[PDB]
């Protein structure tokens, strides 16, 4: 229609044409479906300035059609002109699909020995902590922990417990939540032990943390090291209740083996 | 549910079938076929 | 405003002088308004009427240079000037025979959905005015009920020589349908019927057609033989593959309990 | 004046008692994507309100429901059910007390009243009814002067209900579908407000944007209600929007209401009429014809049939309309029995007399693409009738019996017939013979056994439709 006009070699008709496109885009969504190859060619022209805005409007039209996934790749390759917008229905559907791609990416990559991972692109992982900044602005903790488990990784999950005024009650039934949900033992126990790390970062000397990971992640040396903390501490409440918890709620082999340690 | 654009915009009823052969054709039928005896 | 760019209105293009000036001036229009996604104050639409007429002469220069995608692109531009959201525009002399030219190329290009949106984009005014609509749509009727009888006789009535260029394309869709519809569908025809319908009475053009059938001629005759061989039957392959359809019929017995 | 106080007190209270009190149960029946047993019932009574005795049809005292049910439009702890019972006892403002009319004058602060009363406790079809049923049963006043924007303001508070619909209750409202049903009918009232005088320039890009908000995420019945808007207003106001579909053609998952699916198939078949694709069109317009058996006795099924069967006449063959003739249709002469009478003839003078004499009714046809090839259909009907009658015929018979003035014009007609495959003829291009003939083997050797995969594919798909029917209870 008004898109075949681009046979000129100068790009200013192309910028005038996109100035027409975003103006009268509200009635002509089928015409770009024939201009898909022209979108590809104008995208693969580097020094031509409007490859990125072509990627924007291509995400728009392929969001109208149903090619949401090349809309997603075009949103990635649509420059900072894409990331400057995060307030719309369009943008919330496509960041839902974007961190959908990110979470299937992370669940795939999470079981790989030390590497050989697929390239997690920087845009889809930067909008992760941008949405965590939106969580901090909204001040909401459980939405922040939902996003913190969307990544299935300790990066922003570490940052939710790195916040200020994190009530250890909510952070402690977060352990309950993650106990009843996470399927593999590949990183559920890792979430457990990083929470007992952050509870050793808590100023009160915590023992519900070691009380739980001692009977799940079954550490024979951590009970000995908190016993050396008992040797330092010299209380009588210190050697009593966690002792009873492991003493009626651990393995028969476990305490009878570790008692000599 | 009935409208949606449209409110703005035995007899001979079975005999109509061969009456389509009676109206355009054969109205002086045995006035020519009855005269096939003596026309030739 | 640009006082008059068409100072050589009857001296359109003996060169590409005003064609380069036309690229520059259409680019000046592109710089100034942008196109017509604007409400307009109707004085910026006066140079849009000038833009209509210089895109008419740009269509004439595009058929002068034979750049048909730029021709039909400027033609789609002029149709968008008639798809322009204000009908309240001044009137040009070519206002309907541009639709006539669009109709004629649109019929020559073998697009019949484009033919019916041509008879549907502005339906009611196509019947009476502009005999360069009625003579093409009754010429479509002549293609419907009696073609190869009125083509040259219709070329004999175009006083406005811009329609013979596109009924040369219609002569091409005449000659290919000769090449598909006088041999390899009949029995035999003699040389004088091909001499009448295939004009100039022995070019390498009707010789090109006679050999384009994949066939060798004799003297003073054109047989249309050696076709539809073997009486084909497709021996037992549907018997096999429709049992391979009965396979997923058993799968339809499977998917239900 | 004593008989018109009992009746609205009865019927309007049986409306909203059932409506509100059952929609409460329908939205506290935590999951219901199908149930909606008072939603479609209230739609069956609001289409009946358009027959019946409106919100108030200025019913001979003051028209008082309009200063009644939108005041204190607040559904608190169930003493507001007693507020609605106070709106039952207060129905005799017309007969007992001082009569105040507040239609068309104080309805605008009444349109401000569902917000001026306290927070909506997640029952929007009561407020959707309060944004539709005041002024859209006042479209039947037909004045449409300075109340066009008033009815449009009632639909602006419908747009406030879309704000509270898909900008509020972010956990699975499921009256989103009921409000799709209500919003569809009030989009046809957007039609009945703008399209009386303008087009819906709001709802052009908002037709596409309401398709956007009901594309995949909460799309149920919204898709083809909006697509019937998309495929109905985009017929009179022009075309290639049907070609704007052709790269994003998407229909329902499951077929909807039978009338809805029927008229939708009718719209797309009528679009394929101007596309001149005659293969899919005949079966989908037959489906649409038999699938809408319920119509008002003034007609509208003969309307749908009238504008249906024209391309079926243009097929080259069509059954006789001796199964559709209606007397008011006989007086209105809508599909012209005389036209298909002349189709069965090879007559030209009476057929073009139908044309020239009845161009006044061709105005109501508006489908003038019929004639320029329907004359061709007349001459093809003649040659089809003759060549189907005769085994062998020559040009000397038919080329001058149908006065084609020449052998070769009938040779071109038979050439286009063989190009259509209708006749199996041959032309002796030596003496001037059509040495016509007929093909052989009309026996059931190879053809019906291959057509039985269509027959039995039909059968097994109806088996699977029976299976999916079995799947719902």
Curated annotation (Swiss-Prot), chain A:
Component of the 26S proteasome, a multiprotein complex involved in the ATP-dependent degradation of ubiquitinated proteins. This complex plays a key role in the maintenance of protein homeostasis by removing misfolded or damaged proteins, which could impair cellular functions, and by removing proteins whose functions are no longer required. Therefore, the proteasome participates in numerous cellular processes, including cell cycle progression, apoptosis, or DNA damage repair. Component of the 19S proteasome regulatory particle complex. The 26S proteasome consists of a 20S core particle (CP) and two 19S regulatory subunits (RP). The regulatory particle is made of a lid composed of 9 subunits, a base containing 6 ATPases and few additional components including PSMD1. Interacts with ADRM1. Interacts with ZFAND1. Belongs to the proteasome subunit S1 family. This is 26S proteasome non-ATPase regulatory subunit 1.
UniProtKB/Swiss-Prot annotation, chain C:
The modification Phosphoserine is found at residue 13. Keywords: Isopeptide bond, Phosphoprotein, Proteasome, Ubl conjugation. It comes from the Eukaryota. The keyword Acetylation does not apply. There is a cross-link at residue 204 (Glycyl lysine isopeptide (Lys-Gly) (interchain with G-Cter in SUMO2)). GO terms for biological process: proteasome-mediated ubiquitin-dependent protein catabolic process. GO terms for cellular component: cytosol; nucleoplasm; nucleus; proteasome accessory complex; proteasome complex; proteasome regulatory particle; proteasome regulatory particle, lid subcomplex. Residues 69-238 form the PCI domain. Component of the 26S proteasome, a multiprotein complex involved in the ATP-dependent degradation of ubiquitinated proteins. This complex plays a key role in the maintenance of protein homeostasis by removing misfolded or damaged proteins, which could impair cellular functions, and by removing proteins whose functions are no longer required. Therefore, the proteasome participates in numerous cellular processes, including cell cycle progression, apoptosis, or DNA damage repair. Component of the 19S proteasome regulatory particle complex. The 26S proteasome consists of a 20S core particle (CP) and two 19S regulatory subunits (RP). The regulatory particle is made of a lid composed of 9 subunits including PSMD8, a base containing 6 ATPases and few additional components. Interacts with DDI2. Interacts with TASOR. Belongs to the proteasome subunit S14 family. This is 26S proteasome non-ATPase regulatory subunit 8. The chain holds residues 94 to 350 of 350 of the full protein.
Swiss-Prot record, chain D:
Transmembrane segments: none annotated. Residues 1-45 are annotated as: Disordered. There is a cross-link at residue 14 (Glycyl lysine isopeptide (Lys-Gly) (interchain with G-Cter in SUMO1)). Residues 262-441 form the PCI domain. GO terms for molecular function: enzyme regulator activity. It comes from the Eukaryota. Keywords: Isopeptide bond, Phosphoprotein, Proteasome, Ubl conjugation. Disulfide bonds: none annotated. InterPro entries: 26S_Psome_reg_C, CSN3, PCI_dom, TPR-like_helical_dom_sf, WH_DNA-bd_sf. GO terms for cellular component: cytosol; extracellular exosome; extracellular region; ficolin-1-rich granule lumen; membrane; nucleoplasm; nucleus; proteasome accessory complex. The modification Phosphoserine is found at residues 394, 406. There is a cross-link at residue 14 (Glycyl lysine isopeptide (Lys-Gly) (interchain with G-Cter in SUMO2)). GO terms for biological process: proteasome-mediated ubiquitin-dependent protein catabolic process; regulation of protein catabolic process; ubiquitin-dependent protein catabolic process. Pfam families: PCI (PF01399), Rpn3_C (PF08375). Component of the 19S proteasome regulatory particle complex. The 26S proteasome consists of a 20S core particle (CP) and two 19S regulatory subunits (RP). The regulatory particle is made of a lid composed of 9 subunits including PSMD3, a base containing 6 ATPases and few additional components. Interacts with UBQLN1 (via ubiquitin-like domain). Interacts with ERCC6. Component of the 26S proteasome, a multiprotein complex involved in the ATP-dependent degradation of ubiquitinated proteins. This complex plays a key role in the maintenance of protein homeostasis by removing misfolded or damaged proteins, which could impair cellular functions, and by removing proteins whose functions are no longer required. Therefore, the proteasome participates in numerous cellular processes, including cell cycle progression, apoptosis, or DNA damage repair. Belongs to the proteasome subunit S3 family. This is 26S proteasome non-ATPase regulatory subunit 3. It comes from Homo sapiens (Human). The gene is PSMD3.
């Amino acid at each position: 229609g008004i898109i075949s006009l681009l046979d000129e070699d100068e790009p200013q008709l192309k910028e005038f044409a996109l100035h027409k496109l975003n103006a009268v885009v509200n009635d002509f969504w089928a015409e770009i479906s024939e201009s898909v190859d022209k979108i590809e060619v104008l995208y693969e022209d580097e020094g031509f300035r409007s490859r990125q805005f072509a990627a924007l409007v291509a995400s728009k039209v392929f969001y109208h059609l149903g090619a949401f996934e090349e809309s997603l790749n075009y949103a990635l390759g649509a420059g900072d002109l894409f990331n400057v917008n995060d307030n719309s229905e369009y943008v919330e559907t496509i960041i839902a699909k974007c961190i959908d791609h990110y979470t299937k990416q992370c669940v795939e990559n999470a079981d790989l020995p030390e590497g050989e991972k697929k390239p997690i692109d920087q845009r889809l992982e930067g909008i992760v902590n941008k949405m965590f900044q939106r969580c901090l602005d909204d001040h909401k903790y459980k939405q922040a922990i939902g996003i913190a488990l969307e990544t299935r990784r300790l990066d922003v999950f570490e940052k939710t417990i790195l916040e200020s005024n994190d009530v250890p009650g909510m952070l402690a039934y977060s352990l309950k939540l993650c106990m009843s949900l996470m399927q593999n033992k590949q990183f559920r126990n890792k979430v457990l032990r990083v929470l007992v790390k952050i509870y050793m970062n808590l100023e009160k000397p915590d023992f519900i943390n070691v009380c739980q990971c001692l009977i799940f992640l079954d550490d024979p040396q951590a009970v000995s090291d908190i016993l050396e903390k008992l040797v330092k501490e010299d209380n009588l409440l210190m050697a009593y209740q966690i002792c009873f918890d492991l003493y009626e709620s651990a393995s028969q082999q476990f305490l009878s083996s570790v008692i000599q340690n | 549910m009935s409208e949606k654009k449209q409110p703005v915009d035995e007899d001979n009823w079975d005999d109509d079938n061969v009456e389509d052969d009676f109206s355009n054709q054969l109205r002086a039928e045995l006035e020519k076929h009855g005269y096939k005896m003596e026309t030739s | 405003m640009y006082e008059q760019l068409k100072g050589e209105w009857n001296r359109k293009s003996p060169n590409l002088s005003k064609c380069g000036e036309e690229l520059g001036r259409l680019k000046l229009v592109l710089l100034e308004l942008n196109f017509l996604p604007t409400t307009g104050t109707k004085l910026t639409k006066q140079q849009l009427i000038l833009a209509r007429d210089i895109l008419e002469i740009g269509a004439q220069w595009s058929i002068l240079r034979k750049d048909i995608p730029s021709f039909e692109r400027y033609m789609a531009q002029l149709k968008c000037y008639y798809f322009d959201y204000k009908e309240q525009l001044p009137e040009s002399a070519y206002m309907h025979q541009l639709l006539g030219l669009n109709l004629l190329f649109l019929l020559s290009q073998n697009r019949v959905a484009e033919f019916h949106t041509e008879l549907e984009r502005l339906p009611a005014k196509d019947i009476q005015t502009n005999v360069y609509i009625k003579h093409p749509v009754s010429l479509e009727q002549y293609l419907m009920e009696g073609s190869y009888n009125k083509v040259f006789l219709a070329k004999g009535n175009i006083p406005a020589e811009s329609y013979t260029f596109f009924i040369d394309i219609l002569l091409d869709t005449i000659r290919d349908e000769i090449a598909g519809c006088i041999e390899k569908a009949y029995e035999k025809i003699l040389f004088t019927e091909a001499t009448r319908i295939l004009f100039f009475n022995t070019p390498k053009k009707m010789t090109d057609y006679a050999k384009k059938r994949g066939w060798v001629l004799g003297p003073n005759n054109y047989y249309s033989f050696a076709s539809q061989q073997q009486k084909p039957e497709d021996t037992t392959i549907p018997s096999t593959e429709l049992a391979k359809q009965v396979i997923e019929y058993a799968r339809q017995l499977e998917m239900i309990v | 004046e004593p008989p018109p106080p009992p009746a609205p007190q009865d019927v309007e209270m049986k409306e909203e008692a059932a409506t509100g009190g059952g929609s409460t149960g329908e939205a506290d029946g935590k999951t219901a994507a199908a149930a909606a047993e008072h939603s479609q019932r209230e739609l069956d009574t609001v289409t009946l309100e358009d027959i019946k005795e409106h919100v108030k049809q200025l019913e001979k005292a003051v028209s008082g429901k309009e200063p009644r049910f939108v005041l204190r439009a607040l559904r608190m702890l169930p003493s507001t059910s007693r507020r609605l019972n106070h709106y039952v006892l207060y129905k005799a403002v017309q007969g007992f007390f001082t009569s105040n009319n507040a239609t068309r004058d104080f309805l605008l602060p009444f349109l401000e009243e569902p917000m001026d009363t306290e927070a909506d406790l997640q029952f929007r079809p009561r407020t959707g009814k309060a944004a539709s049923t005041p002024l859209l049963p006042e479209v039947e006043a037909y004045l449409q002067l300075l109340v066009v924007i008033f009815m449009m303001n009632s639909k602006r508070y419908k747009e406030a209900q879309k704000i509270s619909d898909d900008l509020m209750q972010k956990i699975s409202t499921q009256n989103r579908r009921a409000l799709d049903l209500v919003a569809a009918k009030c989009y046809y009232y957007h039609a009945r407000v703008y399209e009386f005088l303008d087009k819906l320039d709001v709802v052009r890009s908002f037709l596409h944007a309401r398709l956007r908000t009901a594309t995949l995420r909460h799309d149920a019945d919204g898709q083809a209600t909006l697509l019937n808007l998309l495929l109905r207003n985009y017929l009179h106001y022009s075309l290639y929007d049907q070609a704007e579909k052709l790269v994003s053609k998407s229909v329902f998952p499951e077929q909807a209401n039978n009338n809805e699916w029927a008229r939708y198939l009718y719209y797309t078949g009528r679009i394929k009429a101007i596309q001149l694709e005659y293969s899919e069109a005949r079966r989908t317009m037959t489906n649409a014809l038999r699938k809408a058996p319920q119509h008002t006795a003034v007609g509208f099924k003969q309307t749908v049939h009238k504008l249906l069967i024209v391309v079926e006449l243009l097929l080259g063959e069509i059954p006789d309309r001796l199964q559709f003739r209606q007397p008011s249709l006989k007086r209105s002469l809508m599909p012209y029995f005389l036209l298909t009478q002349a189709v069965r003839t090879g007559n030209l003078a009476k057929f073009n007399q139908v044309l020239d004499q009845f161009g006044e009714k061709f105005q109501a046809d508006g489908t003038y693409t019929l004639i320029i090839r329907l004359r061709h259909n007349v001459i093809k009907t003649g040659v089809r009738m003759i060549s189907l009658s005769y085994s062998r015929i020559s040009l000397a018979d038919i080329a001058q019996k149908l006065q084609l003035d020449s052998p070769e014009d009938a040779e071109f007609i038979v050439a286009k017939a063989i190009r259509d495959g209708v006749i199996e003829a041959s032309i002796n291009h030596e003496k001037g013979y059509v040495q016509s003939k007929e093909m052989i083997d009309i026996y059931s050797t190879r053809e019906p056994q291959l057509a039985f995969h269509q027959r039995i594919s039909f059968c097994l798909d109806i088996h699977n439709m029976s299976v999916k029917a079995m799947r719902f209870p």
